[PDB]
Structure 1
């Protein structure tokens, strides 16, 4: 599991699908899971517009 250095999206791929950055770090921390963006308070505080695996400390 590698988390992106800009948007924070944790992905298994060679690139973050949401944006498409090749910059993926291994030493990441604090998992955040998103189901809904519009209703969830969590997405608002961080600023994530796409549901799925996001990170905090990279």
Structure 2
């Protein structure tokens, strides 16, 4: 796993193994992040609503 301990975007918190965030495009990926959540269908996800995510995938609640 639920934590770092895949990098998390410092701007939108999406978790990726790519060299840039697919959601917002940022290169600001952190190795230090906590509390993984998974969103499969944004429109039908309570955790998406809670965190404001608009693209499905894995997100960290906390990113340093």
TM range (shorter): over 0.9
1:30-45 pair list within 5 angstroms = 30-45=35-50
RMSD of the TM alignment (CA)?
A: 0.7
Runs of 4+ in structure 1 displaced over 4 angstroms?
none
Q: Structure 1 regions of 5+ residues with no counterpart? A: none
Aligned mate of 2:31, from 26, 29, 42: 26
* TM-score (norm: length of structure 1): 0.93
Aligned length: 58
